Amino acid sequence: KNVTLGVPRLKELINISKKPKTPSLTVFLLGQSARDAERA
DNA sequence: GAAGGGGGGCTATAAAAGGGGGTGGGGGCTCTCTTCCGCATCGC
């Protein structure tokens, strides 16, 4: 995966934008899904 | 037919006369925010 970084990312944070260049969502699994690849 | 020659008109100078014509001068690239339109929704 690729995520915007450096100056272009700094702009998105201070130029707060409705549509980021590379929106992302880090999801953490709660139950047995976290420790089981099949269940994940 | 080329070339030199001769005769005559053009040029300026003043001045008057009177009118036509010439001349010049007026006038009828990217990101963000805002606005408008179509739609579906309820309401009465």
Tab-separated table of N, CA, C and O (backbone and C1' of nucleotides) in Angstrom:
chain	number	residue	atom	x	y	z
A	1	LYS	N	0.825	-1.202	0.000
A	1	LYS	CA	0.000	0.000	0.000
A	1	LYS	C	0.863	1.257	0.000
A	1	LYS	O	1.970	1.263	0.540
A	2	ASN	N	0.347	2.321	-0.610
A	2	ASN	CA	1.019	3.610	-0.660
A	2	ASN	C	0.170	4.649	0.060
A	2	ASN	O	-1.057	4.662	-0.072
A	3	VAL	N	0.833	5.513	0.825
A	3	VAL	CA	0.178	6.580	1.569
A	3	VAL	C	0.945	7.872	1.332
A	3	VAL	O	2.180	7.878	1.325
A	4	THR	N	0.212	8.964	1.135
A	4	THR	CA	0.845	10.252	0.899
A	4	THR	C	1.665	10.657	2.117
A	4	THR	O	1.263	10.432	3.261
A	5	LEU	N	2.827	11.256	1.866
A	5	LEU	CA	3.740	11.638	2.932
A	5	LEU	C	4.501	12.885	2.514
A	5	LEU	O	4.443	13.318	1.361
A	6	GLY	N	5.218	13.464	3.474
A	6	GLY	CA	6.046	14.616	3.183
A	6	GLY	C	5.225	15.880	2.986
A	6	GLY	O	4.145	16.047	3.551
A	7	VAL	N	5.762	16.782	2.165
A	7	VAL	CA	5.086	18.057	1.926
A	7	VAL	C	3.668	17.860	1.408
A	7	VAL	O	2.748	18.504	1.936
A	8	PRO	N	3.412	17.020	0.400
A	8	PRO	CA	2.024	16.876	-0.067
A	8	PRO	C	1.071	16.418	1.021
A	8	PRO	O	-0.090	16.840	1.033
A	9	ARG	N	1.526	15.565	1.942
A	9	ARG	CA	0.666	15.162	3.049
A	9	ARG	C	0.499	16.294	4.052
A	9	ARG	O	-0.595	16.498	4.592
A	10	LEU	N	1.573	17.039	4.317
A	10	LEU	CA	1.476	18.165	5.237
A	10	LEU	C	0.442	19.170	4.756
A	10	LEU	O	-0.289	19.754	5.562
A	11	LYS	N	0.363	19.384	3.442
A	11	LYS	CA	-0.641	20.295	2.906
A	11	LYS	C	-2.048	19.813	3.231
A	11	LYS	O	-2.891	20.597	3.678
A	12	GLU	N	-2.316	18.521	3.034
A	12	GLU	CA	-3.653	18.001	3.293
A	12	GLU	C	-4.066	18.235	4.739
A	12	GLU	O	-5.248	18.451	5.028
A	13	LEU	N	-3.107	18.186	5.665
A	13	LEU	CA	-3.441	18.351	7.074
A	13	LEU	C	-3.750	19.805	7.409
A	13	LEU	O	-4.682	20.087	8.171
A	14	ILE	N	-2.983	20.744	6.854
A	14	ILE	CA	-3.196	22.152	7.173
A	14	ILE	C	-4.158	22.794	6.183
A	14	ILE	O	-4.780	23.819	6.482
A	15	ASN	N	-4.304	22.202	4.997
A	15	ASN	CA	-5.266	22.704	4.022
A	15	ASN	C	-6.553	21.903	4.084
A	15	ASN	O	-7.144	21.596	3.042
A	16	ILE	N	-7.006	21.572	5.292
A	16	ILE	CA	-7.869	20.421	5.539
A	16	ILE	C	-8.866	20.287	4.401
A	16	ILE	O	-9.604	21.228	4.086
A	17	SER	N	-8.892	19.113	3.782
A	17	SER	CA	-9.566	18.923	2.510
A	17	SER	C	-10.661	17.879	2.640
A	17	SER	O	-10.487	16.855	3.308
A	18	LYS	N	-11.792	18.144	1.988
A	18	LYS	CA	-12.893	17.192	2.013
A	18	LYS	C	-12.448	15.846	1.460
A	18	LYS	O	-12.832	14.791	1.980
A	19	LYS	N	-11.634	15.864	0.407
A	19	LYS	CA	-11.171	14.651	-0.268
A	19	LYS	C	-9.657	14.536	-0.158
A	19	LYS	O	-8.926	15.185	-0.927
A	20	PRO	N	-9.134	13.739	0.774
A	20	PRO	CA	-7.686	13.523	0.817
A	20	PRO	C	-7.205	12.788	-0.424
A	20	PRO	O	-7.966	12.106	-1.112
A	21	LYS	N	-5.915	12.953	-0.717
A	21	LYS	CA	-5.340	12.282	-1.879
A	21	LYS	C	-5.385	10.767	-1.722
A	21	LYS	O	-5.723	10.049	-2.670
A	22	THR	N	-5.046	10.263	-0.539
A	22	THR	CA	-4.987	8.826	-0.271
A	22	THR	C	-5.700	8.522	1.040
A	22	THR	O	-5.065	8.181	2.044
A	23	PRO	N	-7.027	8.635	1.065
A	23	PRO	CA	-7.762	8.297	2.287
A	23	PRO	C	-7.551	6.840	2.663
A	23	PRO	O	-7.457	5.964	1.802
A	24	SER	N	-7.475	6.587	3.966
A	24	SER	CA	-7.200	5.250	4.466
A	24	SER	C	-7.900	5.070	5.803
A	24	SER	O	-8.338	6.035	6.432
A	25	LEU	N	-7.998	3.814	6.228
A	25	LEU	CA	-8.724	3.473	7.447
A	25	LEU	C	-8.042	2.264	8.068
A	25	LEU	O	-8.117	1.163	7.517
A	26	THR	N	-7.380	2.465	9.203
A	26	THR	CA	-6.697	1.385	9.907
A	26	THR	C	-7.698	0.713	10.838
A	26	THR	O	-8.165	1.324	11.805
A	27	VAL	N	-8.025	-0.542	10.549
A	27	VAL	CA	-9.021	-1.298	11.300
A	27	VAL	C	-8.297	-2.332	12.148
A	27	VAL	O	-7.487	-3.110	11.633
A	28	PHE	N	-8.585	-2.333	13.444
A	28	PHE	CA	-8.030	-3.302	14.377
A	28	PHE	C	-9.107	-4.313	14.735
A	28	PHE	O	-10.214	-3.934	15.129
A	29	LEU	N	-8.785	-5.592	14.584
A	29	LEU	CA	-9.724	-6.653	14.904
A	29	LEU	C	-9.788	-6.863	16.411
A	29	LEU	O	-8.783	-6.758	17.119
A	30	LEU	N	-10.991	-7.160	16.899
A	30	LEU	CA	-11.266	-7.176	18.331
A	30	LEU	C	-11.163	-8.575	18.929
A	30	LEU	O	-10.372	-8.804	19.849
A	31	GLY	N	-11.947	-9.519	18.419
A	31	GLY	CA	-12.008	-10.841	19.012
A	31	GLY	C	-10.959	-11.795	18.483
A	31	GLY	O	-9.800	-11.418	18.289
A	32	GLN	N	-11.362	-13.045	18.250
A	32	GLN	CA	-10.436	-14.044	17.730
A	32	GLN	C	-9.963	-13.709	16.324
A	32	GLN	O	-8.973	-14.285	15.861
A	33	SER	N	-10.645	-12.791	15.635
A	33	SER	CA	-10.233	-12.421	14.287
A	33	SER	C	-8.816	-11.866	14.267
A	33	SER	O	-8.089	-12.057	13.287
A	34	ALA	N	-8.406	-11.181	15.336
A	34	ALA	CA	-7.092	-10.550	15.350
A	34	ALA	C	-5.977	-11.580	15.243
A	34	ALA	O	-4.990	-11.366	14.530
A	35	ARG	N	-6.112	-12.702	15.945
A	35	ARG	CA	-5.062	-13.709	16.012
A	35	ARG	C	-5.269	-14.862	15.037
A	35	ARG	O	-4.471	-15.804	15.042
A	36	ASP	N	-6.308	-14.817	14.207
A	36	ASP	CA	-6.586	-15.863	13.230
A	36	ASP	C	-6.658	-15.238	11.846
A	36	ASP	O	-7.547	-14.424	11.576
A	37	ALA	N	-5.728	-15.625	10.972
A	37	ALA	CA	-5.731	-15.093	9.613
A	37	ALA	C	-7.000	-15.489	8.870
A	37	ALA	O	-7.588	-14.672	8.154
A	38	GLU	N	-7.437	-16.740	9.026
A	38	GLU	CA	-8.658	-17.182	8.361
A	38	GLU	C	-9.857	-16.369	8.831
A	38	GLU	O	-10.665	-15.903	8.020
A	39	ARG	N	-9.987	-16.186	10.147
A	39	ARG	CA	-11.105	-15.411	10.670
A	39	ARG	C	-10.970	-13.935	10.319
A	39	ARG	O	-11.979	-13.251	10.121
A	40	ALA	N	-9.737	-13.426	10.243
A	40	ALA	CA	-9.535	-12.045	9.820
A	40	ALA	C	-10.002	-11.839	8.386
A	40	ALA	O	-10.592	-10.803	8.059
B	1	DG	O5'	13.387	51.583	-87.379
B	1	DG	C5'	13.096	52.303	-86.187
B	1	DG	C4'	14.341	52.978	-85.642
B	1	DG	C3'	14.100	53.900	-84.447
B	1	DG	O3'	15.138	53.761	-83.480
B	1	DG	C1'	15.056	55.142	-86.224
B	2	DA	P	14.885	54.194	-81.953
B	2	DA	O5'	16.269	54.865	-81.508
B	2	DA	C5'	17.465	54.094	-81.504
B	2	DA	C4'	18.691	54.989	-81.539
B	2	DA	C3'	18.818	55.949	-80.359
B	2	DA	O3'	20.177	56.068	-79.946
B	2	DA	C1'	18.618	57.192	-82.380
B	3	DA	P	20.545	56.865	-78.599
B	3	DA	O5'	20.785	58.368	-79.094
B	3	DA	C5'	21.882	58.666	-79.949
B	3	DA	C4'	21.827	60.106	-80.424
B	3	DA	C3'	21.630	61.143	-79.311
B	3	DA	O3'	22.773	61.986	-79.203
B	3	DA	C1'	20.183	61.561	-81.183
B	4	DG	P	22.838	63.122	-78.066
B	4	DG	O5'	22.675	64.488	-78.883
B	4	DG	C5'	23.576	64.794	-79.939
B	4	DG	C4'	23.040	65.921	-80.803
B	4	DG	C3'	22.846	67.253	-80.072
B	4	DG	O3'	23.456	68.318	-80.796
B	4	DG	C1'	20.828	66.608	-81.162
B	5	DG	P	23.505	69.798	-80.173
B	5	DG	O5'	22.226	70.521	-80.805
B	5	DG	C5'	22.117	70.660	-82.217
B	5	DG	C4'	20.716	71.093	-82.614
B	5	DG	C3'	20.227	72.379	-81.948
B	5	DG	O3'	20.329	73.479	-82.847
B	5	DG	C1'	18.513	70.671	-82.060
B	6	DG	P	20.059	74.976	-82.328
B	6	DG	O5'	18.473	75.146	-82.452
B	6	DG	C5'	17.845	75.033	-83.723
B	6	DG	C4'	16.335	75.111	-83.592
B	6	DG	C3'	15.820	76.335	-82.826
B	6	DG	O3'	14.886	77.065	-83.617
B	6	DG	C1'	14.856	74.328	-81.962
B	7	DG	P	14.452	78.553	-83.191
B	7	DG	O5'	13.055	78.344	-82.441
B	7	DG	C5'	11.955	77.772	-83.138
B	7	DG	C4'	10.866	77.342	-82.173
B	7	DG	C3'	10.336	78.457	-81.262
B	7	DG	O3'	8.968	78.731	-81.550
B	7	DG	C1'	10.772	76.439	-80.037
B	8	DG	P	8.205	79.926	-80.793
B	8	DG	O5'	7.618	79.231	-79.479
B	8	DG	C5'	6.813	78.065	-79.594
B	8	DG	C4'	6.597	77.416	-78.239
B	8	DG	C3'	6.081	78.364	-77.149
B	8	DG	O3'	4.873	77.872	-76.590
B	8	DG	C1'	7.948	77.110	-76.369
B	9	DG	P	4.058	78.757	-75.526
B	9	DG	O5'	4.115	77.891	-74.183
B	9	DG	C5'	3.672	76.540	-74.193
B	9	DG	C4'	4.102	75.818	-72.931
B	9	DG	C3'	3.613	76.451	-71.630
B	9	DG	O3'	3.246	75.446	-70.689
B	9	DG	C1'	5.972	76.397	-71.631
B	10	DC	P	2.552	75.845	-69.296
B	10	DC	O5'	3.440	75.087	-68.203
B	10	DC	C5'	4.852	75.034	-68.358
B	10	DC	C4'	5.545	74.890	-67.018
B	10	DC	C3'	4.956	75.737	-65.897
B	10	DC	O3'	5.070	75.074	-64.647
B	10	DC	C1'	7.152	76.499	-66.399
B	11	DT	P	4.390	75.704	-63.336
B	11	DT	O5'	5.581	76.506	-62.633
B	11	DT	C5'	6.665	75.796	-62.055
B	11	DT	C4'	7.803	76.733	-61.693
B	11	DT	C3'	7.389	78.028	-61.021
B	11	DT	O3'	7.212	77.845	-59.624
B	11	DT	C1'	9.102	78.413	-62.664
B	12	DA	P	6.453	78.962	-58.757
B	12	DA	O5'	7.424	80.228	-58.828
B	12	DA	C5'	8.656	80.223	-58.121
B	12	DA	C4'	9.153	81.638	-57.903
B	12	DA	C3'	8.154	82.562	-57.218
B	12	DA	O3'	8.816	83.493	-56.373
B	12	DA	C1'	8.563	83.337	-59.427
B	13	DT	P	8.009	84.221	-55.191
B	13	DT	O5'	8.383	85.765	-55.370
B	13	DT	C5'	8.724	86.262	-56.655
B	13	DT	C4'	8.115	87.628	-56.887
B	13	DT	C3'	6.634	87.729	-56.567
B	13	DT	O3'	6.442	88.101	-55.207
B	13	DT	C1'	7.074	88.637	-58.741
B	14	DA	P	4.971	88.097	-54.562
B	14	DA	O5'	4.363	89.507	-54.994
B	14	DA	C5'	5.078	90.701	-54.721
B	14	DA	C4'	4.533	91.854	-55.540
B	14	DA	C3'	3.030	92.044	-55.443
B	14	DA	O3'	2.703	92.907	-54.361
B	14	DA	C1'	3.731	92.086	-57.738
B	15	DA	P	1.332	92.700	-53.551
B	15	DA	O5'	0.205	93.098	-54.610
B	15	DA	C5'	0.190	94.403	-55.166
B	15	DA	C4'	-0.906	94.537	-56.205
B	15	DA	C3'	-2.203	93.831	-55.864
B	15	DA	O3'	-3.011	94.640	-55.020
B	15	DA	C1'	-1.606	93.429	-58.149
B	16	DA	P	-4.273	94.003	-54.257
B	16	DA	O5'	-5.451	94.113	-55.329
B	16	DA	C5'	-5.724	95.360	-55.948
B	16	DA	C4'	-6.627	95.182	-57.151
B	16	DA	C3'	-7.807	94.253	-56.931
B	16	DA	O3'	-8.916	94.963	-56.393
B	16	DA	C1'	-6.678	93.662	-58.948
B	17	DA	P	-10.028	94.193	-55.530
B	17	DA	O5'	-10.951	93.506	-56.636
B	17	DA	C5'	-11.480	94.287	-57.695
B	17	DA	C4'	-11.876	93.413	-58.866
B	17	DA	C3'	-12.805	92.264	-58.518
B	17	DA	O3'	-14.166	92.677	-58.576
B	17	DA	C1'	-10.968	91.449	-59.796
B	18	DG	P	-15.172	92.323	-57.374
B	18	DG	O5'	-15.648	90.835	-57.703
B	18	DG	C5'	-16.291	90.557	-58.938
B	18	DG	C4'	-16.370	89.063	-59.182
B	18	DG	C3'	-17.082	88.272	-58.079
B	18	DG	O3'	-18.201	87.572	-58.607
B	18	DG	C1'	-14.979	87.272	-58.638
B	19	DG	P	-19.192	86.774	-57.627
B	19	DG	O5'	-18.786	85.243	-57.843
B	19	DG	C5'	-18.790	84.691	-59.151
B	19	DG	C4'	-18.056	83.365	-59.185
B	19	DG	C3'	-18.606	82.302	-58.227
B	19	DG	O3'	-18.872	81.095	-58.926
B	19	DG	C1'	-16.260	82.544	-57.941
B	20	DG	P	-19.524	79.839	-58.168
B	20	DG	O5'	-18.462	78.668	-58.401
B	20	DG	C5'	-17.926	78.450	-59.701
B	20	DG	C4'	-16.774	77.463	-59.659
B	20	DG	C3'	-17.074	76.167	-58.916
B	20	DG	O3'	-16.498	75.057	-59.591
B	20	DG	C1'	-15.296	77.326	-57.824
B	21	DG	P	-16.763	73.565	-59.063
B	21	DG	O5'	-15.411	73.193	-58.299
B	21	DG	C5'	-14.164	73.355	-58.956
B	21	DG	C4'	-13.013	73.212	-57.982
B	21	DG	C3'	-13.100	71.990	-57.064
B	21	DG	O3'	-11.868	71.279	-57.067
B	21	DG	C1'	-12.806	73.961	-55.773
B	22	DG	P	-11.688	69.951	-56.181
B	22	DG	O5'	-10.578	70.366	-55.106
B	22	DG	C5'	-9.380	70.998	-55.540
B	22	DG	C4'	-8.487	71.338	-54.362
B	22	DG	C3'	-8.341	70.223	-53.334
B	22	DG	O3'	-7.018	70.184	-52.813
B	22	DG	C1'	-9.382	72.108	-52.321
B	23	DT	P	-6.551	68.954	-51.892
B	23	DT	O5'	-6.666	69.526	-50.404
B	23	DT	C5'	-5.909	70.666	-50.020
B	23	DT	C4'	-6.359	71.182	-48.667
B	23	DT	C3'	-6.555	70.102	-47.606
B	23	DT	O3'	-5.449	70.072	-46.712
B	23	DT	C1'	-8.306	71.779	-47.566
B	24	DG	P	-5.370	68.952	-45.562
B	24	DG	O5'	-6.114	69.629	-44.320
B	24	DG	C5'	-5.676	70.892	-43.831
B	24	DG	C4'	-6.701	71.495	-42.889
B	24	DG	C3'	-7.039	70.625	-41.673
B	24	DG	O3'	-6.814	71.342	-40.461
B	24	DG	C1'	-9.036	71.322	-42.804
B	25	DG	P	-6.979	70.605	-39.043
B	25	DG	O5'	-8.466	70.983	-38.580
B	25	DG	C5'	-8.809	72.344	-38.338
B	25	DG	C4'	-10.278	72.488	-37.977
B	25	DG	C3'	-10.748	71.607	-36.818
B	25	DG	O3'	-11.503	72.375	-35.883
B	25	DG	C1'	-12.110	71.226	-38.728
B	26	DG	P	-12.153	71.680	-34.588
B	26	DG	O5'	-13.644	71.337	-35.049
B	26	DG	C5'	-14.540	70.705	-34.147
B	26	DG	C4'	-15.980	71.019	-34.507
B	26	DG	C3'	-17.020	70.190	-33.771
B	26	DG	O3'	-18.210	70.939	-33.556
B	26	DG	C1'	-16.999	69.594	-36.086
B	27	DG	P	-19.320	70.411	-32.521
B	27	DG	O5'	-20.181	69.368	-33.377
B	27	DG	C5'	-21.043	69.836	-34.409
B	27	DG	C4'	-21.777	68.683	-35.069
B	27	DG	C3'	-22.284	67.605	-34.102
B	27	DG	O3'	-23.662	67.322	-34.335
B	27	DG	C1'	-21.022	66.615	-35.848
B	28	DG	P	-24.500	66.453	-33.274
B	28	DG	O5'	-25.266	65.377	-34.177
B	28	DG	C5'	-26.178	65.808	-35.181
B	28	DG	C4'	-26.605	64.651	-36.066
B	28	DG	C3'	-27.274	63.495	-35.332
B	28	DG	O3'	-28.300	62.911	-36.130
B	28	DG	C1'	-25.209	62.760	-36.273
B	29	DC	P	-1.855	26.592	-18.181
B	29	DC	O5'	-2.271	25.807	-16.847
B	29	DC	C5'	-1.503	24.688	-16.414
B	29	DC	C4'	-1.706	24.424	-14.932
B	29	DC	C3'	-2.989	23.660	-14.580
B	29	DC	O3'	-2.706	22.591	-13.680
B	29	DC	C1'	-2.886	25.685	-13.347
B	30	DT	P	-3.883	21.614	-13.186
B	30	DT	O5'	-4.112	22.029	-11.658
B	30	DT	C5'	-3.031	21.965	-10.734
B	30	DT	C4'	-3.502	22.253	-9.319
B	30	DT	C3'	-4.708	21.434	-8.867
B	30	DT	O3'	-4.549	21.004	-7.520
B	30	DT	C1'	-5.241	23.754	-8.789
B	31	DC	P	-5.560	19.924	-6.892
B	31	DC	O5'	-6.337	20.743	-5.763
B	31	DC	C5'	-5.607	21.447	-4.768
B	31	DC	C4'	-6.483	22.478	-4.087
B	31	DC	C3'	-7.810	21.931	-3.558
B	31	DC	O3'	-7.912	22.148	-2.158
B	31	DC	C1'	-8.161	23.896	-4.897
B	32	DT	P	-9.224	21.675	-1.362
B	32	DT	O5'	-10.103	23.004	-1.278
B	32	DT	C5'	-9.483	24.237	-0.938
B	32	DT	C4'	-10.505	25.349	-0.864
B	32	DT	C3'	-11.855	24.926	-0.289
B	32	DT	O3'	-12.332	25.884	0.643
B	32	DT	C1'	-12.157	25.858	-2.452
B	33	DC	P	-13.570	25.530	1.603
B	33	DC	O5'	-14.683	26.597	1.191
B	33	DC	C5'	-14.347	27.973	1.115
B	33	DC	C4'	-15.294	28.712	0.190
B	33	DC	C3'	-16.775	28.533	0.526
B	33	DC	O3'	-17.389	29.792	0.759
B	33	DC	C1'	-16.366	28.103	-1.796
B	34	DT	P	-18.898	29.864	1.303
B	34	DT	O5'	-19.749	30.258	0.007
B	34	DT	C5'	-19.433	31.445	-0.710
B	34	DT	C4'	-20.226	31.532	-2.001
B	34	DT	C3'	-21.741	31.377	-1.836
B	34	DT	O3'	-22.425	32.457	-2.463
B	34	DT	C1'	-20.926	29.868	-3.491
B	35	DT	P	-24.021	32.589	-2.339
B	35	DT	O5'	-24.558	32.036	-3.740
B	35	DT	C5'	-24.093	32.617	-4.952
B	35	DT	C4'	-24.813	32.026	-6.149
B	35	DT	C3'	-26.316	31.826	-5.957
B	35	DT	O3'	-27.032	32.240	-7.115
B	35	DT	C1'	-25.287	29.745	-6.478
B	36	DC	P	-28.635	32.138	-7.159
B	36	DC	O5'	-28.908	30.947	-8.191
B	36	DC	C5'	-28.266	30.953	-9.459
B	36	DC	C4'	-28.634	29.718	-10.261
B	36	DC	C3'	-30.110	29.334	-10.199
B	36	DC	O3'	-30.570	28.903	-11.474
B	36	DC	C1'	-28.786	27.554	-9.338
B	37	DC	P	-32.118	28.538	-11.695
B	37	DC	O5'	-32.107	26.953	-11.898
B	37	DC	C5'	-31.248	26.372	-12.870
B	37	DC	C4'	-31.363	24.859	-12.860
B	37	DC	C3'	-32.791	24.330	-12.753
B	37	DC	O3'	-32.970	23.188	-13.579
B	37	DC	C1'	-31.523	23.575	-10.892
B	38	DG	P	-34.439	22.579	-13.806
B	38	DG	O5'	-34.328	21.094	-13.226
B	38	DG	C5'	-33.293	20.233	-13.681
B	38	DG	C4'	-33.284	18.932	-12.900
B	38	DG	C3'	-34.643	18.250	-12.783
B	38	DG	O3'	-34.509	16.841	-12.907
B	38	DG	C1'	-33.858	18.873	-10.610
B	39	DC	P	-35.812	15.916	-13.073
B	39	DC	O5'	-35.950	15.201	-11.651
B	39	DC	C5'	-34.831	14.531	-11.090
B	39	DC	C4'	-34.978	14.396	-9.588
B	39	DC	C3'	-36.288	13.747	-9.131
B	39	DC	O3'	-36.029	12.480	-8.539
B	39	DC	C1'	-35.749	15.697	-7.830
B	40	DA	P	-36.999	11.230	-8.823
B	40	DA	O5'	-37.522	10.824	-7.369
B	40	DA	C5'	-36.599	10.699	-6.295
B	40	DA	C4'	-37.111	11.408	-5.055
B	40	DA	C3'	-38.429	10.874	-4.510
B	40	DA	O3'	-38.195	9.915	-3.483
B	40	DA	C1'	-38.286	13.297	-4.427
B	41	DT	P	-39.431	9.230	-2.719
B	41	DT	O5'	-39.822	10.294	-1.589
B	41	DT	C5'	-38.838	10.736	-0.661
B	41	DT	C4'	-39.302	11.978	0.079
B	41	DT	C3'	-40.654	11.857	0.755
B	41	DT	O3'	-40.516	11.314	2.069
B	41	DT	C1'	-40.390	13.999	-0.338
B	42	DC	P	-41.578	10.245	2.632
B	42	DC	O5'	-42.568	11.120	3.533
B	42	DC	C5'	-43.386	12.114	2.931
B	42	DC	C4'	-43.075	13.489	3.497
B	42	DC	C3'	-44.062	13.987	4.535
B	42	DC	O3'	-43.416	14.824	5.487
B	42	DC	C1'	-44.303	15.238	2.498
B	43	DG	P	-44.222	15.340	6.777
B	43	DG	O5'	-44.976	16.648	6.249
B	43	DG	C5'	-46.274	16.964	6.727
B	43	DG	C4'	-46.950	17.979	5.825
B	43	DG	C3'	-48.391	18.314	6.207
B	43	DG	O3'	-48.451	19.569	6.878
B	43	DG	C1'	-48.095	18.060	3.815
B	44	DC	P	-49.704	19.926	7.818
B	44	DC	O5'	-50.840	20.378	6.786
B	44	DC	C5'	-50.668	21.563	6.017
B	44	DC	C4'	-51.736	21.679	4.944
B	44	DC	C3'	-53.161	21.435	5.422
B	44	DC	O3'	-53.768	22.654	5.840
B	44	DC	C1'	-52.723	20.473	3.235
